[PDB]
Amino acid sequence: MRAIWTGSIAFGLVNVPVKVYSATADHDIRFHQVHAKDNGRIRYKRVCEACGEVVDYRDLARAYESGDGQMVAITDDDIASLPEERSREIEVLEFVPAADVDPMMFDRSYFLEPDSKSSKSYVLLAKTLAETDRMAIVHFTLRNKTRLAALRVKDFGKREVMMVHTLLWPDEIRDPDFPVLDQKVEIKPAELKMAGQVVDSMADDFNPDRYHDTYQEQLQELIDTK
Amino acid sequence: MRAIWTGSIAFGLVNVPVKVYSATADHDIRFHQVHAKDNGRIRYKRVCEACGEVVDYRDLARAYESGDGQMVAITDDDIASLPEERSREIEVLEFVPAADVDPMMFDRSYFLEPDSKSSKSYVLLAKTLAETDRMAIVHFTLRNKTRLAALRVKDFGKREVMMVHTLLWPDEIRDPDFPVLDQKVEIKPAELKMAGQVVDSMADDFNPDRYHDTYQEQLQELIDTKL
Amino acid sequence: MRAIWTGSIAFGLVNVPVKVYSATADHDIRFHQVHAKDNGRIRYKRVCEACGEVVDYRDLARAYESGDGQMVAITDDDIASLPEERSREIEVLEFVPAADVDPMMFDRSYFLEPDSKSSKSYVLLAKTLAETDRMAIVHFTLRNKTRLAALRVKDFGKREVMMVHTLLWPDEIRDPDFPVLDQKVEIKPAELKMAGQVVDSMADDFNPDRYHDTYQEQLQELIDTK
Amino acid sequence: MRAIWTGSIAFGLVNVPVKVYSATADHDIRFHQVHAKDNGRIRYKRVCEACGEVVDYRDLARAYESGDGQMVAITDDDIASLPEERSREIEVLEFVPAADVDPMMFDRSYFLEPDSKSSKSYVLLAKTLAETDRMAIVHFTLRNKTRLAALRVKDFGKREVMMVHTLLWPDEIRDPDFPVLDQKVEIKPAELKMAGQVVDSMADDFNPDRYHDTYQEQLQELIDTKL
Amino acid sequence: MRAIWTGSIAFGLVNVPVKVYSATADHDIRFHQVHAKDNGRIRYKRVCEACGEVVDYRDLARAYESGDGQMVAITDDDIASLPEERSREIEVLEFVPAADVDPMMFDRSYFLEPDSKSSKSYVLLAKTLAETDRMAIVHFTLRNKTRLAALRVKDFGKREVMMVHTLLWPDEIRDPDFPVLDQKVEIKPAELKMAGQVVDSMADDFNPDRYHDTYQEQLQELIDTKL
Amino acid sequence: MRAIWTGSIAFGLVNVPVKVYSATADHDIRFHQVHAKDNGRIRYKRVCEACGEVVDYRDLARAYESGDGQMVAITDDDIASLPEERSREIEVLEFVPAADVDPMMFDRSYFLEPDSKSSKSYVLLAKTLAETDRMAIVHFTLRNKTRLAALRVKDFGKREVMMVHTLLWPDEIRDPDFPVLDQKVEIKPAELKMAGQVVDSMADDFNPDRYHDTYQEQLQELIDTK
DNA sequence: GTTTTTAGTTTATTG
DNA sequence: TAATAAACTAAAAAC
DNA sequence: GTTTTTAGTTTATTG
DNA sequence: TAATAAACTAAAAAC
DNA sequence: GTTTTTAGTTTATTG
DNA sequence: TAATAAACTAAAAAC
């Protein structure tokens, strides 16, 4: 439970230093390679296929899997050139309505809170964002990696906190084609009514606490065995 | 156009056949390590820290690394002990309005491809879901792994496609334990309106197409330059 | 052994693939024609009477006799007008108690089969039918033709199997208006007692094993000796 | 409206007169063909293939094709050998409980009818059959052909008349070989009860009045238009 | 010349069809009254004693005469009251050994005519009755009249047919007592043998050919001579 | 009840004068045609067809109606000439076995009683016939009318008496010509057993006292009413 | 290729 | 004597 | 084109 | 002296 | 100075 | 089969 990195968002003149904190962390139990004879850890290493010898990662240059399979040498100049990656401060670009954004845009989120002991400006920003209902957007960066992001505030039982989302690039989504789907189909009003009552009978409330990972429960039992 | 997964919605007796296709593809291209000296691709191998000797991935066991350092190879029966492990069909549990589910749980997303023979049933299901406007929370199986997910109706105009979103586990969202905001804060209505005036002056609607990634453009330029 | 068609029950959401099969095949020896003198198989070719010569089957035109025998001019378009042909799935309409159905219209029979690996809904529907003990009336379709048919289950001991029986149209059945049986009838107890005695004397159980198509067996001996 | 047959039930001494009737006459319009360009009704003609010449029907030789299709010479006397064709009385073999027979063996139905002289015996036999509620497996005969058949009573609203339906030879019925269905299947309670509720929702009584052959009505109206 | 009566046996439900033919007819030549003087046959016209007037068949009413001498007109409606009187078919009540019924009660004989289409039941009834050899006592109704009768199997060298014999009512037979034979009679064995030897000496089997109507023969000869 | 006549039975030299008593008499109610309005008996006179005039029996000469219809005159001399009819006694002609005589042959009977006060001969003949069972046949005559007859022994409930039978002439029996039944037939042993068992079920004891003339019983009851 | 089902003829039987 | 059932081909469809 | 009831003769022998 | 129990007759309907 | 937490690969299996 | 599980490693800031 430690901050990933510092954050300074420059909203006009008034900049709020905000510290980010991970909102999630894998529930699954993480294992590592253990040879039965060894009963010890196993680690990979960069072994050159043409050379046939172990090499260090620094010597090796990352290459994209080109269709031609030709050689590529990663150069830090490309990434270093961009100023967004260098800028450790948070960047505010626009506010967009919550209804405008759809489920897809959300990928990952983290909490947000102000570094300074004065949570005033943060409180006003969160409250005005809630009133306007225009989720703010940020070209967020981390470890010299920029990425579009969005802001939202949620009221927990004890308190309310503003927080961020990891926003996928809209170009990335690939709309599908289902030629069979577009074929015309008719619906029977009686069949419609039957479907409605069936779903209502199956319909119920929301029970997040009831949902559980049977696989993770088995993992918990296994670790109890260990 | 690549069918990642196939099956059928095993909801009760509905068993509407469906094919699953990955909804979104990452713009970035996976990288394979290469050494400028070697002038070719590179493939790693595995050596222990106590063997000091290369051991193929097959002989290595999947054992947890506990704090005590004890490591026990994972039992295969326990791996497959889940009754739903075999499943090759998406299974439904419940239905609920969308507002009930919290967006944070959303992790990944796939599209659902129906079949002509059952096209009537799928279309009717989509219509009833749209009318009731009530999301559906459904178990999910994929390459011998279970994952919790929900599905909803999405419209591409006259084309409307049902889709599934992988949902993060309930316990995954960790609450914040923060004293910094536990201190009481007072808000001035004058400053509230002063901030809101700008908040609404610079406000604009969603423009997903307008935004572009400079990093991907630089990557494409590098790819062109190297070939 | 071969399938007739391959459709899928269509009851609202329920869509369980089915591979219908021919319940009963007529094993009676079918008897070809051969010219006695030529000893060659015969072939039917059609000579139009008023024409005076043969006519191709496609050219042959279809007409109607209205009791008076007068012909009628017809076109394929009107036949195509009806939409029943498009039905290539077994639409379901309504269920009925097994007792209600009458045993004089079970014209022909057809089994069902599971095609998709998802047999679960199949067996679930079969068990629901068996428990409720209500037949299902299904608008069976076949070869651009529709025959109102019953849907029912008959546990074969080894494994429950769902069956569909093609039902004669209720309009087809005729309720004979006999003028004789209405006449008043009187019976004394002695004759009824005698009838019960004789019936119980002849009473026994169905014996499928002891039943053989004597004619078919003898003609099979014939066919063998030749 | 005309009888198809006459005879008597040759069981024991009962020998009640019977006037068999056609249970179900197919009202569906059978649709003759006439050559269009001339408007002349077409007649077939039997022609020898090698000869390419018409042949009398009697001169035709009935033949059978072996598993390889090879012909088989066959003579009338051999068919005449079997005597059961002669029997012109509906003998009786046994009486069986009504529920014993499956609802799939019998396809075609046939009514029965007495002659004024001995209507009393007919009615008494019908009443005894109704009371005992056990069918009669009658070794029906017809048109030099013998067909196993069942005998029961279907009391009409006003009168009770015994009926006979031709019964498929239990040899003809084919059992199913369903290796796929042999696969073990599983069921859960909630889905089962939901499906039962749905079925009960669909529950309803037989409605012969509302049931019609849409195609027959439409085509009949069409021909009415033509005339 | 034709059948006297027709109708199927009404045995329970057995109801074997049959028709009745007069077994025997008088051999004597029937005579018709005539007057030699006027060369004309004679009709009979009936009148009362007080009327002295011609009264036709219709205007003549039936009546009964009592010992007191009073007269009661017969009511035709009550005559046919009993259900059996309206029967148009022979009916059987019970069976009995042949010897049980006395030979005294035998008025008339009749033959039975089988039915071609149902002759099997008729023949089988004949055979079973012959095997058991138990003459069946059966009611009998014809010409609006009722009579007792029994049916017996009689076999001709080439034919075997049941035959119904009119049975005299038991009430008709009467047994007046005679004191003449009430006197005790004693006959010695010597006289017994003396009589029996002659009795067996002149005794011979039936000679039906020898027995014949001599008077009818003479009358027929005279008639032929006149004709 | 009085003897019809006193016919003496002649055999060799020993003759037993024996009276004849009617062994039967119809119990039907007696009816005389009576005019309703008159309520008196009805008598008929015999009227000439051509003459239209009443003719008495004495004036009437009997003749037979041949197919021509012409008179066939008959004289009483021919009937009177027969010695048998003149005789007022009964003469035995042959002794025939009782099993020999068929139930057809006799159609009416009359009790036979001894006229002589000494019934020695009568009882002796009765015993001889009973032991020998050689039915005594006689050319019996009544009213100058001769008919073949047989004389039988019956043991009454107290004693044993002799009665005569009216034997129809052997020519009278008409052998039927029924070619239909001459056609052959097969019998099923199972059906044979069923028929035999049915007969046994219906088989019972002789019940002469039961059989009552329901028609004549109704007539008697009506007379009792009137 | 293959079976199976459907649409009409003929052809013959029963009354 | 026309209604009806039985044998049959051809043809068309579904797989 | 019958063949069997049936009242009324008609008789004939009987207590 | 009167009775009545059996043949002849046609009347009449039935089939 | 040490840790965790995450992005980047980077294999490796599987519909 | 490329997507996805499983794991290695870079770095990265946090106290």
Curated annotation (Swiss-Prot), chains A, C, F:
Sequence ranges assigned to domain Ku in this UniProt record: 10-193
The keyword Ligase is assigned to this record: no
Keywords, in A-Z order: DNA damage, DNA recombination, DNA repair, DNA-binding
Record-level GO cellular component terms: DNA helicase complex
Molecular function in Gene Ontology: double-stranded DNA binding; protein homodimerization activity
Region described as Sufficient for interaction with LigD: spans on this chain: 111-226
Gene Ontology biological process terms in this record: DNA recombination; double-strand break repair via nonhomologous end joining; positive regulation of ligase activity
Quaternary structure, from the entry: Homodimer. Interacts with LigD in the absence of DSBs, and with the isolated Pol domain of LigD in the presence of DNA. Interacts with Sir2, possibly in a trimeric complex with LigD.
Assigned protein family: Belongs to the prokaryotic Ku family.
Task performed by this protein: With LigD forms a non-homologous end joining (NHEJ) repair enzyme. Binds linear dsDNA with 5'- and 3'-overhangs but not closed circular dsDNA nor ssDNA. One dimer binds for every 30 bp. Recruits and stimulates the ligase activity of LigD but not of T4 ligase or a human ligase complex (LIG4/XRCC4). Attenuates the 3'- to 5'-exonuclease activity of LigD. Stimulates the template-directed addition of dNTPs by LigD on 5'-overhangs and nuclease activity on 3'-overhangs.
Protein name: Non-homologous end joining protein Ku
Organism from which the protein derives: Mycobacterium tuberculosis (strain ATCC 25618 / H37Rv)
Lineage summary: Bacteria, Bacillati, Actinomycetota, Actinomycetes, Mycobacteriales
Underlying gene: mku
